[PDB]
Structures are given as C-alpha cells and as structure tokens.
Design a protein around this nucleic acid. Structure first.
Ligand SMILES: [Zn+2]
Lengths: 81, 143, 193, 129, 150, 87
RNA sequence: UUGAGCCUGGUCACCGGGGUCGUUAACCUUCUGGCAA
RNA sequence: GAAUACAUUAGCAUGGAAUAAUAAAAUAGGACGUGUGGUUCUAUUUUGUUGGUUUCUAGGACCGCCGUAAUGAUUAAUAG
RNA sequence: CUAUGCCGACUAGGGAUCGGGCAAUGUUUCUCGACUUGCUCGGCACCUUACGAGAAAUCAAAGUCUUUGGGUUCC
C-alpha cells in the first residue's frame, strides 16, 4: 500500500480480478476438442457456447447453452488446447 | 441550371461587335482570360450560350476581392447564394461564436452548380441590386 | 547447374546472393516434396551484419507473394542455411515500402493506406523478425533522461535454439528501426490458460 | 462521456500525489499526454513512466516522487500569444521562478519559458508546479 | 451510460492480445469464407454467423483467419443486405411494438418505448445516410415500415 | 535559496519525510524521527552509528507509517522477509 | 515520421538558426535553361 | 533634433504544421505513362499580303487494353 | 423531495442485501435445488473516519475550488 509495482502484478492478484479490470484485458474462455463416446471423430467446442452442438457422426446433443459455461453430459474424453 | 435555346427571347441574343461576311464563313466566337491564375473552361470556348454578364465570352471584368463559399440556393435564374461562415472574436470572454453571411453571385451556364458544391467567386462590378460577385472556380464533389 | 540460377535473385551482387543461390540450389537438388515446394521459391536480397559479440547474421528479404509457401518451407531450410554458412544466423524479413507523411508543401492525392504506415510497418517488421514465437505483450519504458526502450514480452513455446536467436533478432531490430528493444520470456506458472 | 484525456490524466496524477502514493495508473493514453509528461520529466517533477502498449488507446504506469503541488489542465485551449504568456504566468503560476505552463506551440509541446526562447505562441494545454 | 436507460453495465467481450490466427486450427481461410457464404444463403444475421462459428465450428474470431470482417466478406461476394442488420432489427422491433399498440391502445409504457425506438431509429438512419450506407432520401415512414421489414 | 551574492539566506531549511518526500512544518506535532543503530557479529550494537528516518504527521494519521517504515528498512537492508514490492 | 550522427557561421559549459546522408526515399510536383540514359 | 512604440478588431503577404475538422481509391469512377492505337479543336510558325480547306508540325481533351509494384478497407475505447 | 440536473475520470476501511457469473476431489435432499465460503460486475442502502469540503447542521459527495478551467442544460 502507498507503494506498489503496477508493472508486474501477481498472478494470484490477477486471476481474482475482472477480465476488463486487469492490466491488459484478455479472454477467460477457451476451446476444447471432444470425442463422441461411440465414434471416432473429434469436434472442437467453445466453453461459452450459445448453440446446441451436434456431432458430425450419428450422435445426440453435445452440450446445452447457459449463462456461463455449458455443461457436457456425453461421456466425451475432452482435450483442452 | 437548365440550358435552353440561346435565341429564346424577344431580342436576338448575340455577341456584340462580331460580324460574319462571305470571306469568313460562319460566326467566329471570342473568348478572354479573366486572369489571376484562372483558366477559361473548354465548353465556354465551344458552347452555345451568350451570357453578357459572364466573366468569359462576356463584358464583365474580374478585379477586387476573391471569396470562397458554399452555394445554398440555385432556384433563381443564372445567379446563386453563397453562404460564408466564420468565427467572431469576443475579447471579453476570449471565445468564438459562429457567424454567417449570405452572398449573391452570378453563375454562367459554363458551371453546373447545385447545392453543397462550394465554389470560389470574385468581384465583377455590380450586376443586379445585391449581385457583385461571379463564380470563377468550382471544386465539385463529383470530381 | 543447368542454369536455373539467375532467376532466383533479381540482382547480381559480388558474392552474397551468388553463394546464397548456390547453397539453395544444393538443397533443392533433393527431389520429392522439397523440390516441389522450392520450385516456386525465389529471393530478393541478403545483407550481412554483426552482433555485439562475434556472430554474423544474414538478413534475407522475401517477396510478399511468397510468404504463404515460405512459412512452411523456411523451417526445413534454415538449418541447412546455418550449417552451410559456417556458423552464420539467417533471419527472414518481408520487405515492404512505406510512404511519406502528407506534408503541407507535398500533396499526395493517392492516399497512404494504413498497411504502408511507418508505425504499422515497424509493428509488422517486429512481428516478422521473431518468426517462431508470437508477441504477447509490449511496453515502452521512458527513462528519466528521456531514453525510450521497448520491452517485448514473448511466449514460452518452441524454445529450441531460439533463446539467442531472439538476441540476434534484437540486434537486427536495433538498427532496422532506430529503437532500442529487448525481448523477454515470462514465466508460465501452473497448467491451463 | 470522455471529453479530454489529458484532464483525466492530470486529475489522477494530482490525486495520487496528494494521497502520497509513489505510483499512478493512467488510462487512456495519447500523444498529448506523452508530450506533457516528458515536458514534466525534463523539468524534474515526474519520474519514469512505462507505456503499456495494448491493442487499444493504451495504458501507462507513472512513478511519482512528490515535489509537485498541482498539475492541471486549461480547458478550453485558449490561444496564447507571446505577450499573453506573462499574463497567464501571473494568473496561474505560483511565482515567476517556480511553475511551468505547457503550450502546444506549432514547433511542439513545450514549456512557456522555452516557447518564449523560440519566440512562438500557441494554445495553452496546462500547468504544473 | 445507456442511451435510453439509466443502466451502467459494462458487459462485453475482451478480445485477446494475440491478433493472429489460432495456433491449433485448420480453418483454411477460403473454406470458412465459403462456409459463411453457405450460412448467408441459409439466411442468418452476421451476429448469428459469428456465434455459430465460435460456439460450434471452433473459430474464435473469423477476421483472424479470413483477414477481413464477415460483413466485408459478404459485401465482396455480393450477399450484402440492403438494410444494415442493426437498423433492420430496430425497425422490426418498432413494427412489433406498433402492432402491439394497435391491438392494445392502453399500453402507455409501450407507447413510451415506441417513442424511444423511433428516436433511436432516426438517429441511426441519420448516421447511415451521412456515412453513405443508405441513399440520402432514405426516410422512415411507419406505414411502409412493415413492407421495409418484409 | 541563494541570493545574487551566493550565500544561503533563510530562517531554516525544513526536513522532508522519507516516506512521501514532503516537508515537515513547524507545527507538525505527529511527525516523528525513528533512530535505529546497526549491529555487528554476536549482537552488541555499537553506539554512535545509526540510521534515521522521518515520518510526517499526514502519513501517521493515514496509517501508512508501518508499511513505509518497513519499505525504508528493507531498502536499507536492516530487515529481511517483511516487505515486498510485489503484492 | 519519432529519435540518433555532422558541416558551417552567430551574444553568453550552454542556446536559437540553414543543409544534408543511413534507419525508410529523402526539397514531393510543375515551367524554364543546361547537361543526356 | 523635432524619434520610437502603443495600433494588428478587419483586410494583404511570408514562415511552422503541434493542437481542432471534412473526401483523398470500392462496383477502383484510382500516381498509373519519350508506352501499344484512334479522334476533336487551335494555329501560338513557315508555303509572297488579308481571307477559305486537308493537316506534317507543337499543344489542350476523350475512348478499350498493357502489372510499372507489396495494388487499396486503423485496433475495435472497462464509449455506444 | 434525495428540498441535492445529466454524462465521464480518480479518491478510505469494513460488514449486510438484491440480480447475474466464476470456483469448491464443500454439506445436505427422494444432478438438480437449498445452504456455506471466496472473487467479480451492476443496483438499494449502512457503520467508522475525515486525506478533503462546508457558515455549520453535515457530505464518499455537498471531495479532487484563491493550488479557482472535463463537457453540457435549467435557475
Ligand atoms: Zn450430435
């Protein structure tokens, strides 16, 4: 207090702040590639998806849109990158 | 505005002191340069109109002041209204205010003038009551 | 050999581009994918520079219509270039042409697009010089006397033989833009974003 | 909405200086803000400032050292001639020896004293002392 | 500072610093461009284009891979709607409010909201006529607003 | 300040607080001086060698005196593992 | 389109003023006179 | 010796382009130029003097093509 | 009527409350809800204090105003 290093804020002090209020604003979302439980194709999905996702092969709904992070109910071994 | 047949009046619209004889066929047309760095438009050199009160192929002369303004009204015949805008000085408040004055200039058929289309005018001797300027250069938005 | 050398370089300097053409032809002697990708590949100019130590760098200008192939083709030839050039670094830069500021006495009615802007060109040069690693931050620090230094924060991906390639990158950018610059790798604590 | 960014920058700086903090974060940044700060820096009132270059207007972090009383802006940008510099100095500066008036002279952003040396007036930006 | 409300929300999207195509992606640029064209023929707004592409197909920002905005792509390839999307949505909302009012004349709150929407539409139309997106004699009449939407 | 002759003419030169670089007025009755002596091996601090700090009344009322004194001692090297510039 | 290095001459380690070269091409463009690919 | 300045609102002229504005080309309607071809006018010169025609000649302007080369759209503001 | 115009920037410590979001190898009830904790955005307010303001009552604005200038209406 009364003397801080605004150039290099702590990572913990940054992950607890709003995305806009950070020193340099950045996204908090990401994309992950999921696999159908009974198939072999891999489809990339968004963490904040607003639309019903359907796998390319014969499969049911993937995730349900919501206000925040959508919930995955299919048994997909998702890899996030 | 709209150019009609030049001989559409009671009197034969003619360039003064120009004659056609048997030796020199047809009727020659005379043109002059207004000066002050301006150039005579090509359609004035080869046109149809007469326009006795025109800086080109006419009798008026360009001398005095040269102003620039945006033409607002073209509904009247062969003349327009130029709107000059400037900022006035108030020494007390050290600030400006917007002041405008409307001019009155003559437009030849040589220049196609519409709304907007700021032009440059020059003194050309009194012409009609409040008309003392004539359009010389046009910086058109189309070109 | 068998011609196919002159068209590689637009100009004919003393020895620089001639040796560059000979080395790239020797690499292109290999058939298959390398030959196919190197067939529509050329060069414009090369410049030899020194670094603060005793290392030598070669700045090669690349034409704009070749970067699409150069992105996936230069990785397989940079190792051969540094091996053949006898311990000389190679740095590819996309050559551009910037336009004058529209001064009062000089009217330019053609307009200067933003892509041909000195600041935009400097940013594009900075992006191109650090080829493998991308930029994640940049800060302009002004000293008390008024000297301006640029701190460019890079990423921590593909650090194979680039920890001093970036130092050579700073060495070129020292005289290619007239601004002192230093690149720094941050610390990626934890796993996730 | 935001009208001038220099006024917000100077208000934040003077608030931090009065509070006694050694640093202040300024957003947004601009060329006028930068030129004002380097003029203050070459006169010794402000220490180093780092310009955080975002893909936006950009931010800046300023290191303070006290020794300034108040830095403010003069809105609107009144036109100041050479003869009016003395009147503005008497109106705004604490004295004839302490205090700096910044003018956006056609040569560039500069202090009133060196604007007098260059013999060129301009528009008044602000002041600091 | 809401234009027609007292709210002070700051909810928005913070684009990343890296203005580059995704490191792990195979969008192939032209394939996405034709994909946007296919969806445009299907008849969805550019906002829906970006939402679907981001949520389902996996491209975060289309301009990162394509090099131009999706509206620019649509205009370049010819599928450019005569009315801008924001103005079309505002006029459609005004039509819906007017229909609600004409069926139920006692909704003073709806009348007030219609006045706000009318003012917003006129301000947006003036901006578009000034910039050149619409003919200078565009105008806005409630009688022909339904035909304008349809 | 110095006149044209060159000598220093004034009643006195006020001292400036090390925590905020502001002068201390004659009636700043909350402004105190902190004196700490250095230490050698096996303790037994030698008298006569000390470092001094001045904290103004504004800082004392604001409550920043503790952290300011922590910064001053840490910068001087008298304390370890108490104050950090990165919070 | 910001900064760095010079020449020369001006009242006091200092300041204002004119030209340049490379970063990046450095009096844009026109008319006249000369040299000319 | 009978100066000099104050004056400059407003007009005229020289120098600077920081501060505050509008278009510099989108359907490229673009610097494009001892460049591949054409057409409209004028004689600023000479054919012996005015005058009438073709135009070598020198100049003003309009029509499809030729990549000269890096061919053109500022981020998207803890504004809307 | 908050006898206190609207927009925008900054400024001290804490705890309640409403709406949303994030996180918990947290609890509970036949995949969700309820409860608990922390963070954050936008509101309604509250306690202490006064770097600061006021003639004072008092005010986180009525502060950043003789160190007097962010913009704009009413009076
Ligand atoms: Zn499915």
């Amino acid at each position: 207090v009364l003397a801080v290093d605004l150039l290099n804020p702590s990572h913990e002090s940054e992950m607890r702040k709003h995305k806009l209020k950070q020193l340099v604003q950045g996204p908090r979302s990401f994309f992950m590639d999921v696999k159908c439980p009974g198939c072999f194709n891999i489809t990339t999905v968004f963490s904040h998806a607003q639309t019903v996702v359907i796998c390319g092969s014969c499969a049911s709904v993937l995730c349900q849109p919501t206000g925040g992070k959508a919930r995955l109910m299919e048994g997909c071994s998702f890899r996030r990158k | 505005a709209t150019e009609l047949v030049v001989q559409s009046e009671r009197a034969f619209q003619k360039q003064p002191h120009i004659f056609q004889n048997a030796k020199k066929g047809a009727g020659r047309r005379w043109y002059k340069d207004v000066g002050l760095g301006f150039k005579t438009p090509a359609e004035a050199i080869y046109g149809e109109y007469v326009d006795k009160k025109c800086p080109f192929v006419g009798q008026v002369s360009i001398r005095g002041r040269i102003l620039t303004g945006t033409v607002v009204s073209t509904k009247m015949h062969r003349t327009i209204i130029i709107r000059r805008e400037y900022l006035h000085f108030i020494p007390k408040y050290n600030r400006y205010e917007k002041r405008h004055k409307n001019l009155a200039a003559h437009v030849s058929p040589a220049f196609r003038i519409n709304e907007g289309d700021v032009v440059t005018v020059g003194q050309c001797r009194p012409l009609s009551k409040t008309v003392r300027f004539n359009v010389l250069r046009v910086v058109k938005h189309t070109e | 050999a068998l011609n196919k050398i002159v068209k590689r370089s637009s100009s004919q300097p003393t020895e620089t581009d001639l040796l560059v053409a000979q080395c790239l032809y020797d690499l292109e002697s290999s058939s298959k994918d390398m030959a196919k990708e190197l067939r529509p590949l050329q060069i414009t100019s090369a410049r030899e520079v020194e670094v603060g130590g005793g290392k030598k760098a070669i700045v090669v200008f690349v034409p704009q219509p070749l970067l699409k192939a150069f992105h996936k083709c230069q990785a397989r030839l940079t190792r051969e270039l540094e091996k053949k050039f006898a311990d000389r670094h190679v740095i590819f830069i996309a050559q551009r042409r910037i336009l004058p500021k529209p001064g009062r006495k000089s009217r330019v009615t053609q307009k200067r697009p933003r892509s041909r802007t000195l600041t935009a060109v400097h940013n594009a040069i900075l992006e191109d010089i650090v080829f493998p690693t991308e930029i994640i931050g940049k800060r302009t620090r002004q000293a008390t006397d008024g000297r301006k230094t640029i701190k460019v924060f890079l990423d921590n991906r593909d650090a194979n033989t680039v920890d001093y390639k970036l130092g050579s990158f700073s060495s070129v950018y020292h005289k290619l833009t007239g601004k002192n610059v230093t690149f720094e790798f941050p610390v990626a604590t934890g796993e996730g974003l | 909405v935001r009208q001038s960014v220099l006024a917000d920058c100077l208000n934040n700086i003077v608030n931090a200086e009065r509070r006694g903090r050694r640093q202040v974060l300024i957003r947004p940044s601009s060329k006028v803000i930068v030129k004002f700060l380097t003029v203050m820096q070459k006169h010794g009132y402000i220490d180093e400032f780092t310009e955080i270059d975002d893909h936006r207007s950009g931010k800046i972090v300023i290191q303070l050292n006290g020794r300034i009383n108040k830095c403010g802006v003069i809105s609107p940008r009144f036109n100041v001639k050479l003869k009016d510099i003395e009147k503005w100095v008497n109106q705004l500066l604490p004295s004839r020896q302490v205090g700096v008036i910044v003018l956006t002279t056609s040569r560039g952003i500069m202090s009133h004293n060196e604007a007098r040396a260059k013999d060129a007036g301009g528009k008044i930006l602000g002041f600091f002392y | 500072g809401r234009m027609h409300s007292k709210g002070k929300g700051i909810a928005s999207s913070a684009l990343p610093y890296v203005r580059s195509p995704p490191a792990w992606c195979k969008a192939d640029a032209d394939s996405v461009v034709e994909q946007i064209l296919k969806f445009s023929k299907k008849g969805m707004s550019p906002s829906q284009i970006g939402v679907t592409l981001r949520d389902s197909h996996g491209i975060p920002q289309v301009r990162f891979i394509t090099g131009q905005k999706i509206m620019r792509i649509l205009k370049a390839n010819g599928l450019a709607p005569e009315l801008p999307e924001d103005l079309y949505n505002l006029i459609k909302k005004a039509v819906s409010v007017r229909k609600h009012l004409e069926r139920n004349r006692k909704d003073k709150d709806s009348k007030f909201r219609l006045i706000l929407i009318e003012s917003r539409i006129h301000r947006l139309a003036r901006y578009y006529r000034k910039v050149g997106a619409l003919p200078p004699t565009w105008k806005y009449e409630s009688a022909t607003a339904s035909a304008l939407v349809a | 300040m110095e006149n044209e002759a060159g000598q220093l003419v004034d009643l006195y030169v006020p001292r400036k607080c090390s925590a905020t670089n502001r002068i201390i007025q004659a009636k700043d009755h909350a402004s105190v001086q902190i004196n700490v002596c250095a230490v050698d091996a096996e303790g037994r601090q030698i008298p006569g060698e000390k470092t001094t700090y001045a904290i103004s009344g504004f800082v004392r009322s604001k409550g920043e005196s503790d952290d300011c004194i922590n910064r001053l001692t840490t910068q001087d090297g008298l304390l370890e593992g108490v104050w950090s510039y990165q919070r």
